[PDB]
Design an enzyme around this catalytic site. Structure first.
Site, mmCIF file in Angstrom:
data_model
loop_
_atom_site.group_PDB
_atom_site.id
_atom_site.type_symbol
_atom_site.label_atom_id
_atom_site.label_comp_id
_atom_site.label_asym_id
_atom_site.label_seq_id
_atom_site.Cartn_x
_atom_site.Cartn_y
_atom_site.Cartn_z
ATOM 1 N N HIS A 1 0.809 -1.212 0.000
ATOM 2 C CA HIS A 1 0.000 0.000 0.000
ATOM 3 C C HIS A 1 0.853 1.278 0.000
ATOM 4 C CE1 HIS A 1 -0.288 -0.414 4.564
ATOM 5 N NE2 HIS A 1 0.119 0.848 4.448
ATOM 6 N N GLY B 1 2.131 5.799 9.983
ATOM 7 C CA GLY B 1 3.579 5.816 9.811
ATOM 8 C C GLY B 1 4.246 4.529 10.286
ATOM 9 N N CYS C 1 3.259 1.423 9.617
ATOM 10 C CA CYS C 1 3.149 0.338 8.648
ATOM 11 C C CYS C 1 4.522 -0.109 8.177
ATOM 12 C CB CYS C 1 2.249 0.732 7.486
ATOM 13 S SG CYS C 1 0.555 1.076 7.985
HETATM 14 C C1 LIG Z 1 -3.506 4.908 10.405
HETATM 15 C C2 LIG Z 1 -2.944 3.606 10.917
HETATM 16 C C3 LIG Z 1 -2.790 3.388 12.282
HETATM 17 C C4 LIG Z 1 -2.289 2.182 12.729
HETATM 18 N N1 LIG Z 1 -1.922 1.186 11.913
HETATM 19 C C5 LIG Z 1 -2.050 1.391 10.599
HETATM 20 C C6 LIG Z 1 -2.569 2.561 10.047
HETATM 21 N N2 LIG Z 1 -2.826 2.674 8.660
HETATM 22 C C7 LIG Z 1 -3.893 2.137 8.021
HETATM 23 O O1 LIG Z 1 -4.676 1.363 8.558
HETATM 24 C C8 LIG Z 1 -4.116 2.576 6.563
HETATM 25 C C9 LIG Z 1 -4.782 1.490 5.724
HETATM 26 C C10 LIG Z 1 -6.122 1.606 5.379
HETATM 27 C C11 LIG Z 1 -6.802 0.542 4.808
HETATM 28 C C12 LIG Z 1 -6.145 -0.651 4.548
HETATM 29 C C13 LIG Z 1 -4.801 -0.744 4.848
HETATM 30 CL CL1 LIG Z 1 -3.933 -2.193 4.417
HETATM 31 C C14 LIG Z 1 -4.114 0.302 5.438
HETATM 32 N N3 LIG Z 1 -2.963 3.249 5.905
HETATM 33 C C15 LIG Z 1 -2.979 3.205 4.440
HETATM 34 C C16 LIG Z 1 -2.841 4.639 6.339
#
Ligand SMILES: Cc1ccncc1NC(=O)[C@H](c1cccc(Cl)c1)N(C)C
Ligand SMILES: Cc1ccncc1NC(=O)[C@H](c1cccc(Cl)c1)N(C)C
EC number: 3.4.19.12
Lengths: 304, 304
Positions: A41, A143, A145
């Site tokens: 992503h 951040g 990820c």
């Molecule tokens: C904000 C946050 C807080 C804690 N761990 C991860 C995130 N990011 C996410 O969940 C998202 C996202 C949305 C939908 C699907 C997926 Cl695979 C990822 N990213 C792209 C910002």
């Protein structure tokens, strides 16, 4: 004496963390040998995440579009491929800090340490269990990820998790290092059902054995039970059914304390039916399930 | 989202751990520059520990009696001195892995990470608070002496603790890196009174602010209190009295959540007087006091 939720020393993993940037997005990558691993992503913008066609989005990208930085040094990207939900960036330099490593797909109920990272830099380390529903209750912000989960045997790091997503319920989902999600999760901004979670019975029993070893023995009683009787109580309290394989794994702890596994089960049954009556066990007022029998043996013997 | 008892990444500290042997005894040392630091009781035998005359025991020792090993390499000891309850072994080689470091004497109620070690090798990392009674509730077995506690600011490691002793009550005591014990403890095998411990009120409030930030808000109520009214409740439940300095430190968390500090105090007062009624806060069934306001800000903002 004492019993703590202990994580593995994170040093070998800290030396693998890099920052990966693609266009506007920056996340963490894991640099092992000449390959950098990160959530796919990273190639998305906020307009894409609702329903991304990762294949088509990756087609608009070249090696030079992926910016990889390890501390202050820039890595040269010479190849890029997508494997399930992970991107593999071939760089021209092998990480000189690469530890002896393996990629493993852990089983639900098993534990691992997480090194939370932002912009390729580590912020903290904590111990997690992969829930029976394949989610993890971690601590991750935007951040984070690409931050990873791992176990360490002697000098070998077994990487088992890569963080991808926070669900609307605040729980976490991610992949193994081949990019396969744990559970039914998909990498898109959609409402995703995390199934019913259960308590890891064999881990609660392991923790009760840790409590006895460390002096907390108030919960021991004059009772016993059978696997079928105990399992009638486990189903009622959404606890995983206990099997003879679980009893076998608790054998070292039963041998060390002289308390038969079914006698410990009878203590657990009474704790489930009556609560703790305002008392604590190893500093906790609830039944702890994020310590495996292996973790208890390791912490109680002093394995380094 | 999510809130975990997170430790600092241990990498910079792992590269400092060495094994120190004197006669029959082996424990951990911390190698910074050309000095190896370890508990002075490394010079004792079991007959000495009841009432050791450390000065006379150290007189029977020469540089060649202190065996220091860092991984597989043997360090050459060229000097030895005792500073309070620590021994300082001058070696001929500066540790090439020495991070930017400081020695600090932390205040009770403050937190730090511990890297538990055996034979100079790290086994795990966990987060601890220095109790108001100057003990720590850690996880340490025989061989763990010399393991250290630290905090990390950017690239600087502030070493604050060195493990020396387990008290008959199973709690832990040690020194700062100048060898001064925290609390009234002495390094001898005698019954030692660890005073009455209290709950770190400012930390419980910081953790309540973390709970609100992460979605756990059931405990918020329509009430308020005053510092004097709250402190009447804190004394009854053996909680540290809350001061305006504590209120000032909770200011960032009050600004972020829009909940005045005295309104959070009224929630805490009701939790103290009524319990949790079978509910949990951030996965805990008891009031957690081993997170400082700084820790909450750090974990909630993403400081690396
Ligand atoms: C904000 C946050 C807080 C804690 N761990 C991860 C995130 N990011 C996410 O969940 C998202 C996202 C949305 C939908 C699907 C997926 Cl695979 C990822 N990213 C792209 C910002
Ligand atoms: C066994 C153990 C378990 C956990 N943490 C430490 C120890 N060691 C100790 O408490 C003792 C000792 C006894 C008396 C005074 C002091 Cl300073 C040290 N050493 C010498 C073995």
């Amino acid at each position: 004496s004492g019993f703590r939720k202990m994580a593995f020393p994170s040093g070998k993993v800290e030396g693998c963390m890099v920052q990966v940037t693609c266009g506007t997005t920056t996340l963490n990558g894991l640099w092992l040998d000449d390959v950098v691993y990160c959530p796919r992503h990273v190639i998305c913008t906020s307009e894409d995440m609702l329903n991304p066609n990762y294949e088509d989005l990756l087609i608009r990208k070249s090696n030079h579009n992926f910016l990889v930085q390890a501390g202050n040094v820039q890595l040269r990207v010479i190849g890029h491929s997508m494997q399930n939900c992970v991107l593999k960036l071939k760089v021209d330099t092998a990480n000189p800090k690469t530890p002896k490593y393996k990629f493993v797909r852990i089983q639900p109920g098993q534990t691992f340490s997480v090194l939370a990272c932002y912009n390729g830099s580590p912020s903290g380390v904590y111990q997690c269990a992969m829930r029976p529903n394949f989610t993890i209750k971690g601590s991750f912000l935007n951040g984070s990820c690409g931050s990873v989960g791992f176990n360490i045997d002697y000098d070998c790091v077994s990487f088992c998790y890569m963080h991808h997503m926070e669900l609307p319920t605040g729980v976490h989902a991610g992949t193994d290092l081949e990019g396969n999600f744990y559970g039914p999760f998909v990498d898109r901004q959609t409402a995703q059902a995390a199934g019913t979670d259960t308590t890891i019975t064999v881990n609660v029993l392991a923790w009760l054995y840790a409590a006895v070893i460390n002096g907390d023995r108030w919960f021991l009683n004059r009772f016993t039970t059978t696997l079928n009787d105990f399992n009638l109580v486990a189903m009622k309290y959404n606890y995983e059914p206990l099997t003879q394989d679980h009893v076998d794994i608790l054998g070292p702890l039963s041998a060390q304390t002289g308390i038969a596994v079914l006698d410990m089960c009878a203590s657990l049954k009474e704790l489930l039916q009556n609560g703790m009556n305002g008392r604590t066990i190893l500093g906790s007022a609830l039944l702890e399930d994020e310590f495996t029998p292996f973790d208890v043996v390791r912490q109680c013997s002093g394995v380094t």
